[PDB]
Amino acid sequence: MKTVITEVIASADSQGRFLNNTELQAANGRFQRATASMEAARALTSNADSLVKGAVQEVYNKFPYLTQPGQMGYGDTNQAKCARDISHYLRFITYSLVAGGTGPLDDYIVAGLREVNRTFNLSPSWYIEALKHIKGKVGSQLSGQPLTEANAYIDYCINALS
Amino acid sequence: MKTVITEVIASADSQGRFLNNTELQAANGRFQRATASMEAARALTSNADSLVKGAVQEVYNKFPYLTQPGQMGYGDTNQAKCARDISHYLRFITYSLVAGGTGPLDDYIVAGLREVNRTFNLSPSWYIEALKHIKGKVGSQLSGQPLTEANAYIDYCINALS
Amino acid sequence: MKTVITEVIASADSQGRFLNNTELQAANGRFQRATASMEAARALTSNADSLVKGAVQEVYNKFPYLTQPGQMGYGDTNQAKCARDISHYLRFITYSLVAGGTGPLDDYIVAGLREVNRTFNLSPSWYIEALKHIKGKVGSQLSGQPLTEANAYIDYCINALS
Amino acid sequence: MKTVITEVIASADSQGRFLNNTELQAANGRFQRATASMEAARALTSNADSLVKGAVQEVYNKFPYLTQPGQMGYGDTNQAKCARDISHYLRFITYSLVAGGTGPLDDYIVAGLREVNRTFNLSPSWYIEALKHIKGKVGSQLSGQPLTEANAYIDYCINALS
Amino acid sequence: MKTVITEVIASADSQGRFLNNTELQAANGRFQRATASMEAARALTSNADSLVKGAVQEVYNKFPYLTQPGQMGYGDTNQAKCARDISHYLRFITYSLVAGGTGPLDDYIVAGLREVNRTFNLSPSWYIEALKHIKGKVGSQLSGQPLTEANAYIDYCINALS
Amino acid sequence: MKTVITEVIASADSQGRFLNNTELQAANGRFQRATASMEAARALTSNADSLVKGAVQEVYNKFPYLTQPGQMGYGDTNQAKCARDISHYLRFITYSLVAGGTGPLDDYIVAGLREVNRTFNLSPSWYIEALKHIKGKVGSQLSGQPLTEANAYIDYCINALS
Amino acid sequence: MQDAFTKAIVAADLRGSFLSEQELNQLTNLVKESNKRLDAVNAITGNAAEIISDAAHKLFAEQTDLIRPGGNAYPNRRMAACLRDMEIILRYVSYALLAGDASVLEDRCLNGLKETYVALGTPTRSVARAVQLMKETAIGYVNSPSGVTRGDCSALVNEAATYFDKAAASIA
Amino acid sequence: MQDAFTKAIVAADLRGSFLSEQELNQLTNLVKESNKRLDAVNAITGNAAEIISDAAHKLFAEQTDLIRPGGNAYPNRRMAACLRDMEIILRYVSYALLAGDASVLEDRCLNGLKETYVALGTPTRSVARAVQLMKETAIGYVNSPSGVTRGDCSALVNEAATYFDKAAASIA
Amino acid sequence: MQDAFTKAIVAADLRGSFLSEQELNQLTNLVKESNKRLDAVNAITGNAAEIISDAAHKLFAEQTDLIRPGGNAYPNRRMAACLRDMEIILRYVSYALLAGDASVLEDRCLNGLKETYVALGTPTRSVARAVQLMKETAIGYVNSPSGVTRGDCSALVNEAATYFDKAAASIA
Amino acid sequence: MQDAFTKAIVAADLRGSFLSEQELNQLTNLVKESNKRLDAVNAITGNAAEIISDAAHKLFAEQTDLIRPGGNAYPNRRMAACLRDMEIILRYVSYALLAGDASVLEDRCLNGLKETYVALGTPTRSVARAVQLMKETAIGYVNSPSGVTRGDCSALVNEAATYFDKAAASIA
Amino acid sequence: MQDAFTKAIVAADLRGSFLSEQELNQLTNLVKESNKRLDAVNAITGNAAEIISDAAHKLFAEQTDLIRPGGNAYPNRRMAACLRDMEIILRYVSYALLAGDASVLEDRCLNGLKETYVALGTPTRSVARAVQLMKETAIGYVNSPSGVTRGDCSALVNEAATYFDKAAASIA
Amino acid sequence: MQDAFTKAIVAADLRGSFLSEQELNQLTNLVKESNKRLDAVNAITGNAAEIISDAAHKLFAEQTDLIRPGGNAYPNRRMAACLRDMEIILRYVSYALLAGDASVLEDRCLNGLKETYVALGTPTRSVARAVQLMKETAIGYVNSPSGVTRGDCSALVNEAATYFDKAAASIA
Numbered sequence A, B, C, D, E, F: 001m002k003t004v005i006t007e008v009i010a011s012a013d014s015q016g017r018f019l020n021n022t023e024l025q026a027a028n029g030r031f032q033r034a035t036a037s038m039e040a041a042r043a044l045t046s047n048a049d050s051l052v053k054g055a056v057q058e059v060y061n062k063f064p065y066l067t068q069p070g071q072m073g074y075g076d077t078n079q080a081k082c083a084r085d086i087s088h089y090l091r092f093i094t095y096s097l098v099a100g101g102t103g104p105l106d107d108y109i110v111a112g113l114r115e116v117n118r119t120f121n122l123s124p125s126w127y128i129e130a131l132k133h134i135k136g137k138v139g140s141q142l143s144g145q146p147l148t149e150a151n152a153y154i155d156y157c158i159n160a161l162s
Numbered sequence G, H, I, J, K, L: 001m002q003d004a005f006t007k008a009i010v011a012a013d014l015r016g017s018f019l020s021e022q023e024l025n026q027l028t029n030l031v032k033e034s035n036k037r038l039d040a041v042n043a044i045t046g047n048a049a050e051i052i053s054d055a056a057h058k059l060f061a062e063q064t065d066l067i068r069p070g071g072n073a074y075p076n077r078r079m080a081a082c083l084r085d086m087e088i089i090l091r092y093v094s095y096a097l098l099a100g101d102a103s104v105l106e107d108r109c110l111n112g113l114k115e116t117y118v119a120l121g122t123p124t125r126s127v128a129r130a131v132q133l134m135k136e137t138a139i140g141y142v143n144s145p146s147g148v149t150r151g152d153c154s155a156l157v158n159e160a161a162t163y164f165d166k167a168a169a170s171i172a
């Protein structure tokens, strides 16, 4: 799973090489950034329920036809899967924050994303809109480098979905 | 040439990928370490003439037979090449310090090292001893993380010669 | 471009081989099917204007929100590009019919389809619905093997979009 | 074993692909040709004994030295192996006719042909003469597309021996 | 072209290596054998006309049907090409003797042999018989190691034709 | 293991080929050289103790510092390993002489030589000097082609150490 | 690879015989029925995506454990691998249906596949269930085509089922 | 690779058009003549070895300098390479004849071939002559098959000639 | 590949010199400004899809010839190849911006690219225009970030422009 | 490959949970101790050749059987293979120490290695001893750096030992 | 690969010894007899096609089941594979005869071969019989050459037999 | 690859002739002188490292610009590449000396080498000088063996010089 630390190890290993000062300075960058990252993760974890609820409701505000009979935002099961999915994204964002890299998102959401969404008729636009709403809300919960960290991973997702 | 920055770009590039937060945190480690590294480079630069002289003389102290007629520490040319070579090592250590990686040493000293030394009958032991002496001297000029940076690159050379 | 004829030639060529009775029977199947295929192409060509008009309007009946301000079925240009695109599909269906294979569709629509639609935010949804509408209409225009031909290439497109 | 059907399946499979209208038209050519092919196979099967007998004797008329003592057409064993071998060829021609391809001939006669004949001192010229004789006889037993089918596989063998 | 000398050089070169005592001893074997080999070449060169003439006649002796009208030993041109071809074989045998290897025969006769003979309907049996007859005659012209050399290259050809 | 015989077999085998006169002449060079080679091996074997003894003592005469306390020619164990190592070289030279190639030296001394010597701090100069002393002594024990053989394998080692 | 005709030839050769009447008549019936066979293969190809999608939807409703953390169709990477397998198996089943012989399915798909799944920790019976679910939807399309001449395809439907059923039994 | 149908489609697409009546009528006539086309391709395939061997015998009777030391069809290795080239050209010409289009011959055979020959020192006009000699023998077989329905194949013969003549002109 | 620090080392080595206080002061500037540099790179990465899509929409609105039959962004295959190229160039430009040096852009992207486009018949000025539009949208994102500390990034914006302008001038 | 953070995430995902307080607090302490971790990794890297060489000298002084004819560290080729193995194992141990997780050592080094040695006739307990000896010398360097801030590294030393002991137990 | 000299060296090295007078004496004899050895190897090479052909003709006269439908030397493809195997084995036997050592035959030919045949359904006893027939014809040629100096080759004939008999015993 | 004997055969074949008395005489002379030739090749092989090193030391004493920053034998990587080239050229020269023909040197070493050096910015006249210094030292060893039978090797020395001089003229 991709983190700064697995990445620098992969680098040294691809060259049959002991880790040197090149890779250790890199690793220090991961460790120095951890405090800001963990502060972001903590804020997203503790506001998770309301961040998910609001995001799901913003999807239905943006695409109102979804909540009509026959549509994919209609019924308890469709709506429960939405909340679950948006909870997944937020969970994997917190993981990436704590991990020091995009690996959790890459491995659990991004690999297979379009194949899966195509087969189950899931529009990336719904998830992009959910994530933009979460981004708006996180902007009042965090500032400074914790905000920069959170935004990086939220934007990463939005891009993966585009 | 290997630095944290070229190595994270190479990483992203090998995967056909934009740089993401993984690589940017790594890069920050390079930038955050630069101050200590530049302090080390400056001390080694300003002390270079005496560090080289003392290092060359320590080689002769440790292997006295070298300065006898017919031997490879005898004569002004043999001794001038010694001072030149040791200045090369110190120059490339300072470059590596400033560069944020082993690249300068790898590309200019380490690649071809054994083949060159074998052909010209240069003992790695002479250079190891020169570098150990320089390391002793640097230990009284620098402390803290500048020292840790200097020592890393001096030890890197000692290992490449072993 | 893939047709029965280019396919059997590619087959013989991949083995360094003259065409034999195996490939000539195959080619006969292409030639025997041409009459039905060309009858299908003729019916689709002559009703192309009304097939396109109706298909575009069915997209808007199925997804009414599209024709609201700010949406991708709003305005002369959005709607002109729709009619053009649906006309492309029908044009390449007729080409495939006449060509004795999916090659025209493969080379001009299928290759790059998802990458293009993703970048320009084009829902396969819309095109699937346009094609299903065309299929309904063609069902009263053709029967027998001309119908079976037309349906094959329409369904090919629907599958490529799924 | 190569038939139109195994060949179109191999084609679709080599591209990771469902069979489409390109391959199905090809397969129809196989099926449409089966009647003529089976009529050819029936005629060759029912006249097999006299076709083999006359072919073997034609080898001896064309190369009379073969039936002299010490030669390869001398004796009941040499002559029994001749009738067997010619019956082999006729049997694999009927199999190819029925199979919709050259596969039976390719797999059982053509693969290894020259190496085997070289080792056992079998002249291709004998077999070419036997096959030309059979072709003459079949010309009075069949007409139209059954003839065209029979001739294709007889000629295929003559070519493989040249 | 394969000789002991080109062989041992190829060997050293494939390993990125200077020639050592292993290859030099081998090369000495080539040089020591040269006297016997050149004595064989001399005898085959000076008897070439009668060796070729007798070999061609022995082919017609063994396969009398060839000299009948319509056959491949009939007429001045067919017979001239026979004498030419048998001269080629003898010439390349002398070259191989002198060269210290099979290379001349490999490069000029053996590469392409079966393909060429198959296209022009040339039986290897004719050439095998010509070569056996030459071998009988050479047995009275040479003895000892010159004979052993001559025989080796004659047998080499017989095998390449089998 | 590389000898003329394994070499020519490898050559024929790499081409899927029977051994021919090319390889057999080479093999004769090996067999013809054996007498001189075995005479060389015989003289080195019978003088082995005094050749090793004198070679070790010449190393100490050429590099006198080695026998001082703390140095690598000081003490029973360092000096016993020297005599053992020099005995290995002489043993593998006799093997290569008898074997008709460098294979014993290649496989048992040359493969891994630099890596081993680098790790245990063994100077090639010591061994070169020992071999040059042995070469001087062998020059009074052998003459002619036995001498040329002995010198080839001694020089081979000196070069492998350079 | 073998087809129905090629299979018969191989058997007749092992007897050293020209094909028998009996063998020729099975092959004559296959030729007679071949247009229906082409329609049946066309029904699968023309509806492939929907066959996989309908089967997938049903499988994950019946076995919700697969789409939870810890389940073998979680995360997105495992769901994508799963859907890809369904497409692969459906592709080889349809090849077998054109050939009139299961050998392509057996040789290029089913051979060693259970062992692969067991080594991966993929629940083999859930893969089998997926295959059966695809059979049901695939047969529905064979039986419900657009403007095809009405007639009886029950024999071809049974044959199609055997190919799907072999896949499922080989995997489970 | 293109065939006659695919060539028309590519042109109609550059105009942004459905195929015209004129284009459709020329394709309809190719379909009408396609059995004769299949017989003509079959004439080359069924007689390929003899077409090459007849052409080869005639070439080396007209140009005896090729089969002497110093000549480009000497020694055996060069003769073999020569015969192989005749085979290759005949194979691509016959592909073009099934396709009704020379693009496979041009793309996979003729493109850059003269330059290859010039680099090798192969006499390009002698290769061209070999192609012409194969044309003559090949057309002889197209015109004299066993038990084919009698009719006029002059158009297909002329078309076959164009593909051979295109090879010759490209090489010479 | 080089970066800004590595470039200085190379030049100092050609003089046989330790780095000067001028060169070191120049590198100290880059370290001091490096957080802004990371934000600037982050602006491009975090908005990459939108930079490409905004640029693409504008290009094809201006040059409607490219999306007609006969045009080099038609059919879907050519449009996809076009979009992929925009992504590749934007990716190498952003690498250059982290590095502080254009060598990765030049070595792994721009070198020989115009010649490739000319061989393909791709209109090089239209590619150059795509790069210009991506520059504009990319620079907009560098200047309009969410919740970043307010300051002056004009030097880094100018530097980013030079890398885009390097690509355009190399291609056009 | 996993690291200490990634390992925790994998486990929290199997529960369908955000990371717990407890998990976060052990990751927070790893971050707190990370500078010492970097010094410990640096101790091994900076003294790698020396660590390998002292361990090798000691092994061959304890087990003189290995450096006699018939022994597995004779001739030069086997000694070189042996020394290479020591370097490989020390490299993967040090990777594990940066990662805070043994998975890279298990996956890319230890997996199947005993079986390889048994097939080769390499004495597995002598390899284990070599690893043990490298642990002792490597830990000595971790405890004896030059000019590092003084403090307590016992936990990191214990952790390093576990990775070495892991390797030895897996091999022996 | 080993030869007779190399085999002795390997054994002397395991003892930590220079070669003994006994070992040197055996190698001296091999050198003395080496011209006869070269004739013996020459007898096989110069008559290789004939040895395989005589052996093949006898095998299939004896075991007529192999050349009937159902037999393992039927059809042409199996007969060709069979003849190729006879050539391969005879080649490796003759290599062993030049070397004075069976290791090349065991390492590059016989190792795992019976298992390969059992998996294929090739009757291993019939392969062994082919080898035995090749031995008889090969030994005939070694004994009855054109114009070689008359003498006793019984030891070399016995040695050649061992290599053939080792092949047969390893396969059967 | 050609040798002296093979070169003659190629020329005789272009005439359609058996080798002449004159050609056979040259070749007889080469055989007669072959033991000297083996000693001359053995002089280069046995002293290869010293030849390269003596030449290298002289080159860099003469051209001290090459070993300064900016010079083409600086840094260690360029020096190693340089030494490697000297060894490569000396190896192909010695191969040509065993062969009695320069074709191996020309085909596998010299062909296109000047162009390579010019592209790299390697000073071709300095490479040529290296080759000339190696020639001098190599010829010194040919003339200075240990315990070789005394005689005249001037012809072989002159021939060795031609191979070195071919290399130098081809490179400069």
Ligand SMILES: *[C@@H](C)[C@H]1/C(=C/c2[nH]c(/C=C3N=C(/C=C4\NC(=O)C(CC)=C4C)C(C)=C\3CCC(=O)O)c(CCC(=O)O)c2C)NC(=O)[C@@H]1C
Residues within 6 Å of the ligand: A033, A144, A145, A148, B021, B024, B025, B028, I032, I033, I035, I036, I037, I038, I039, I040, I042, I142, I143, I144, I145, I148, I149, I150, I151, I152, I153, I156
């Ligand atoms: C122009 C680019 C915009 C802008 C930038 C700007 N940034 C800062 C300050 C900081 N930016 C960072 C960002 C990072 N640190 C990292 O390790 C990484 C990779 C994970 C990033 C992206 C940090 C740590 C700082 C310092 C602390 C802070 O939050 O301020 C400034 C302030 C000046 C400075 O150089 O520090 C500025 C001006 N400013 C703008 O207005 C542009 C829109």
